[PDB]
Amino acid sequence: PLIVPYNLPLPGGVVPRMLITILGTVKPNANRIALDFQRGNDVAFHFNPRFNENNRRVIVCNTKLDNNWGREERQSVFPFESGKPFKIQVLVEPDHFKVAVNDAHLLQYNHRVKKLNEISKLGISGDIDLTSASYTMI
Ligand SMILES: OC[C@H]1O[C@@H](S[C@@H]2O[C@H](CO)[C@H](O)[C@H](n3cc(-c4cccc(F)c4)nn3)[C@H]2O)[C@H](O)[C@@H](n2cc(-c3cccc(F)c3)nn2)[C@H]1O
């Protein structure tokens, strides 16, 4: 029953084997969801499911450096559904963010921001009811 947009501090930044778990429910008639792993004003990893882009479902991933978005990485496999509960797991690897949704691997995102310890906040926003957001070391 948390509040969106939600800020989850990541003390000391991210590190390989860190597992971030977000539990929530997609709102009815949802338009978009966004996870933003931030390094100061930069966004190291933007994870952005879009429910209506040209009447398609798509997940857009990108990095924002000095107020400029970079080249998008798109995943057409779309495991979110309006009205339904979800679990997003982000596993930090040495070279990638690894994303699984509802216990099924979804995508990996190669680190463009390479100072992982400086990625110290996770912003959670968009059309969801947020149930929980936490992290653990596996
Ligand atoms: O990069 C990610 C960002 O993108 C722009 S939209 C973007 O604008 C560009 C022009 O400036 C391009 O038109 C781009 N594009 C690429 C392609 C394409 C590329 C390759 C192949 C192919 F076929 C098609 N088509 N169009 C658009 O996606 C969003 O505003 C932004 N954002 C999202 C949010 C946000 C805020 C609150 C909640 C939330 F969920 C998200 N707050 N900022 C963020 O998600």
> What would the two tokens of residue 36 be?
């933003």
- Provide the CB-side half-sphere exposure for 84 (13 A, CA): 9
Is residue 53 part of an annotated ligand binding site? no
Q: How far apart are CA 134 and CA 20, in angstroms?
A: 6
Q: How far apart are CA 116 and CA 54, in angstroms?
A: 34
Is residue 74 part of an annotated ligand binding site? yes
Q: What is the dihedral of CA 118, 122, 97, 100, to 10 degrees?
A: 160
Q: How far apart are CA 20 and CA 9, in angstroms?
A: 11
Instruction: Fill in the amino acid letter for 97.
Output: F
Cβ atoms within 10 A of the Cβ of 75, count? 17
Alpha-carbon torsion (58, 59, 65, 66), positive or negative: positive
Q: How far apart are CA 63 and CA 49, in angstroms?
A: 15
Contacts of 27 (CB under 8 A, 6+ apart): 82, 83, 127, 128, 129
Measure 71 CA to ligand 1 centroid, in angstroms: 10
Instruction: Provide the CATH topology of domain 1-138.
Output: Jelly Rolls (2.60.120)
Query: Are 133 and 122 contacting, i.e. CB atoms less than 8 angstroms apart?
Result: yes
Q: What is the DSSP annotation of 36-97?
A: EEEETTEEEEEEEEEEEETTEEEEEEEEEETTEE---EEE------TT-EEEEEEEE-SSEE
Give Cα 23 to chain centroid, integer Å.
Answer: 12
The CB of 69 under 6 Å from ligand 1? The reply is: yes
Cis omega before residue 5 (within 30°)? yes
Measure 24 CA to ligand 1 centroid, in angstroms: 23
Q: How far apart are CA 103 and CA 86, in angstroms?
A: 10
Exposed/middle/buried for 4, CB within 10 Å: 0-12, 13-18, 19+?
A: middle
Measure 136 CA to ligand 1 centroid, in angstroms: 30
Query: Are 50 and 127 contacting, i.e. CB atoms less than 8 angstroms apart?
Result: no
Experimental method: X-ray
Q: Structure resolution in Å?
A: 2.0
> What would the two tokens of residue 6 be?
């939600």
What is the domain partition of the chain in residue ranges?
1-138
Q: Phi, psi (5° rounding) for residue 118?
A: -95, -5
